Amino acid sequence: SFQVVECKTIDGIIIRGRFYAVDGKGPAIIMTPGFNCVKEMLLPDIAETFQSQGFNTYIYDPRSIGDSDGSPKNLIDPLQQAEDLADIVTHISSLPSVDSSKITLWGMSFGGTVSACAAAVDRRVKALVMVCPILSFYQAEKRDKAFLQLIRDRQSQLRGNEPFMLPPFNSKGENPIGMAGSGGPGGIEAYGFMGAVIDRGAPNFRNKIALQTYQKLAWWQPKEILKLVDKTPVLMVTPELDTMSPPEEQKAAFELFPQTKKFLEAKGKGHLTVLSGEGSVEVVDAMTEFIRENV
Amino acid sequence: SFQVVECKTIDGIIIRGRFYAVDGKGPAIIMTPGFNCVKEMLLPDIAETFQSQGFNTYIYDPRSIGDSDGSPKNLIDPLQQAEDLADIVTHISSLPSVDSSKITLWGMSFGGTVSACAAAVDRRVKALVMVCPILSFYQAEKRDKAFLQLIRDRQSQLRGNEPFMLPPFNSKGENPIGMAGSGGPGGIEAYGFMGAGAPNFRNKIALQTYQKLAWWQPKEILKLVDKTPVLMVTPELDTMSPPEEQKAAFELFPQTKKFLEAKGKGHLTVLSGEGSVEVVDAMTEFIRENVAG
Ligand SMILES: COC(=O)CCSC(=O)C[C@@H](O)/C=C/CCC[C@@H](C)O
Ligand SMILES: [Cl-]
Ligand SMILES: [Cl-]
Ligand SMILES: [Cl-]
């Protein structure tokens, strides 16, 4: 059982999401979805487990995505999502059933890297959990053409046209900047899930992003921001066969963390299946174990 | 005589500045001022020399600064300033006297680093001039305190209050993050500079500026500038941006480049006084040589 809980940002935007409350006053986990994904995809299964084990759990749609406010639509600014998490933490910490001293930031894929950026600046975050985080986006060979495409979109917007939209992965599993396994098995699998005409419980999901998302991704240096995360206990869950975010890149980032940390590799899992199938129950139990051990 | 020229951004914000036109059609230099500085500080003298040598020149107040649109006021987002430059390049390139194939980005201090970020993405920028670029902002000892103050400003705003404002340099020359020589000679010189014809100059910034500086990693973005001819002018005695940091970034550039160290000059005096004429002529010569259409 969950209730709809809305969080206001400092610029007046409403973040909308699901809040799985627990009885009494207990800790809270705030879950951020992956790139352009909505709260209804996969995460409600994890939240019910978190809730049954005594954790208030909040899954939300990030700015301009799903049920949440934000214009232009599906313009993914990771630094803005990280800042919004500070405002989300504020509202969730004020809820009656929430112990504000026991806040954990949980993120999957893109949302895991966004969560770490928020934890670097917000000491209210007592624990960080990153599932298959993505730390790079541009293929060097496609940079110049993607840049030119971004500029021409700006000029097109200055002439009155709408911001150019496109799927994060086309039918060939590709995208202009080559992110997240574009041109390989991972991008093809990503398109298969995002483009499927299936009821996933998320009417407001949209398999399109604004092209200017790639402009924000060009500024973002997440590997440098994660170096600021030097106090928050961090748990990283990496799929062994991640074809969208190279496991070695995730492992290189985990190496730099000097504080209390824990690494878990999900054998035989990919970017999208790391929290599903056999072994997924043991992985989720390890997440709550790590939080309680550090909360 | 200069004319007021406005540049619309993709989100509808109006950027305002001075345009120094030349007869006929010719190259254009877009000058970005330093941290929270207005177009009337120092730069008009440089633009008149550029104009007399055949260069259209556009000095502008960045977003939320001076005469330009932008809210909240004096919130310095360098990444947004970099994106705004793409729109500024678009409007300046459309002007009758401007050769759209001969656009040069020019920046001083903070504005020099912002110009490099815009040059990394826009191939219309045919040359880059960076004057005393600043490439780091946080002192490690002040990081956690500044981060906590930023979160508390967010909680204050969420209760309905205006964003917390403060001078970028106090009377001791300090600021919460330790940027631009805070606590030493650099900060005191910047405090005196900010403290004494721009009606909309405001000696204050939003605290949330420091949140934007925390995300910024310009040393990594400067690595993307691998094609644009770049001239860097570094003061030998820069007390606000370490010369070693400026030189280290310059040495990484693989393309056509030139480095000039202004002997005995500081962050704010690099383009003033003795030897400043030769530095400006070195800029015009680098631009004529590298941006020929
Ligand atoms: C069998 O389980 C599944 O297929 C669920 C697939 S959606 C999911 O994992 C929830 C979402 O937060 C994570 C998305 C990662 C893909 C987007 C990535 C490019 O950032
Ligand atoms: Cl929709
Ligand atoms: Cl032209
Ligand atoms: Cl020719």
In terms of Cα–Cα distance, which of B65, B119, B124 is closest to B91? Answer: B124
Task: Report the separation in Å between the CA atom of B101 and the middle of ligand 3, taken as the mean of its atom positions.
Answer: 6
Provide the 10 A C-beta neighbour count for residue A89.
25
Residue B119 CA to residue B224 CA, distance in Å, equals 9
Residue A115 CA to residue A31 CA, distance in Å, equals 9
B86 within 8 A of B58, measured Cβ to Cβ = no
CB contact under 8 A, B90 and A224: no
B70 within 8 A of B7, measured Cβ to Cβ = no
The H or E element spanning position A92 is helix A78-93
**Angle between the A280-294 and A43-52 helix axes, to the nearest 10 degrees?**
50
In terms of Cα–Cα distance, which of A287, A4, A257 is closest to A116? Answer: A257
List CB contacts (< 8 A) between A228 and chain B.
143, 214
Q: Could you tell me the two tokens for B264?
A: 């005995």
Which of the listed residues A41, A113, A136, A283 should we mutate to test ligand 1's pocket, taking the one with most ligand atoms within 8 A of CB?
A: A41
SS3 state of residue A3: strand
Residue A95 CA to residue A6 CA, distance in Å, equals 11
Residues paired with residue B104 on neighbouring β-strands, in sequence order: B29, B127
Ligand that lies nearest to the alpha carbon of residue A277, given by its number in the listed order: 1
Give the rounded distance of the alpha carbon of A138 from its chain centre: 18
For the Cβ of A169 lying below 6 angstroms from any atom of ligand 1, the answer is no
In terms of Cα–Cα distance, which of B121, B106, B114 is closest to B30? Answer: B106
List CB contacts (< 8 A) between A137 and chain B.
none
Distances (CA, A) of B138 to B124, B152, B177, B214, B231: 32, 18, 5, 8, 26
Distances (CA, A) of A156 to A101, B87, B174: 48, 11, 43
In terms of Cα–Cα distance, which of A217, A287, A222 is closest to A249? Answer: A222
Q: In terms of C-beta distances under 8 Å and separation of at least 24 residues, what long-range contacts does B244-248 make, across chains too?
A: B245/B135, B245/B136, B246/B132, B246/B133, B246/B135
SS3 state of residue A290: helix
Q: Could you tell me the two tokens for B287?
A: 């631009």
Structure method: X-ray
Between A87, A123, A218, which is nearest B158 by CB? A87
SS3 state of residue B260: strand
Smallest CA–CA distance, residue B145 to chain A, in Å, is 10
Residue B6 CA to residue B92 CA, distance in Å, equals 9
A205 within 8 A of A198, measured Cβ to Cβ = no
Residue B84 CA to residue B101 CA, distance in Å, equals 19
Q: Where are the alpha helices (DSSP H) in chain B?
A: 43-52, 78-93, 110-121, 143-158, 185-195, 209-215, 218-222, 243-251, 276-290
User: How many CA atoms does the CB half-sphere of A108 hold within 13 Å?
Assistant: 28
B152 within 8 A of B146, measured Cβ to Cβ = no
Residues paired with residue B260 on neighbouring β-strands, in sequence order: B233
For A110, which DSSP code? H
Smallest CA–CA distance, residue B184 to chain A, in Å, is 25
B98 within 8 A of B92, measured Cβ to Cβ = yes
Provide the 10 A C-beta neighbour count for residue A65.
26
Which candidate in B121, B125, B149, B210 is best for mutational testing of the A interface (most A CBs within 10 A)? B121
Total residues belonging to chain B: 293
% helix / strand / coil in chain A, to the nearest 5? 35, 20, 45
In terms of Cα–Cα distance, which of A225, A184, A264 is closest to A79? Answer: A225
Q: Could you tell me the two tokens for A76?
A: 């993914």
For the Cβ of A276 lying below 6 angstroms from any atom of ligand 1, the answer is yes
Task: Report the separation in Å between the CA atom of A160 and the middle of ligand 2, taken as the mean of its atom positions.
Answer: 22
List CB contacts (< 8 A) between A215 and chain B.
83, 121
Residues 6+ apart with CB under 8 A from B215: A79, A82, A117, A219, A220, A225, B79
Instruction: Show the domains of chain A with their CATH numbers.
Output: 3-136+220-294 (3.40.50.1820)
Q: What are phi and psi of B106, to 5 degrees?
A: -130, 135
Tell which atom from ligand 1 comes closest to the C-alpha of A109.
20
Residue A166 CA to residue A82 CA, distance in Å, equals 23
Residue B243 CA to residue A239 CA, distance in Å, equals 44
Q: Could you tell me the two tokens for B269?
A: 């005096």
For B135, which DSSP code? -
Q: Could you tell me the two tokens for B118?
A: 């815009």
B183 within 8 A of B174, measured Cβ to Cβ = yes
Q: Which residue has the tokens 């020149």?
A: B57
Residue A214 CA to residue A75 CA, distance in Å, equals 9
Structural resolution in Å:
2.1
User: How many CA atoms does the CB half-sphere of B278 hold within 13 Å?
Assistant: 6
SS3 state of residue B234: strand
Q: What are phi and psi of B278, to 5 degrees?
A: -70, -30
CB contact under 8 A, B220 and A221: yes
CB contact under 8 A, B215 and A225: yes
**C-alpha R_g of chain B:** 18
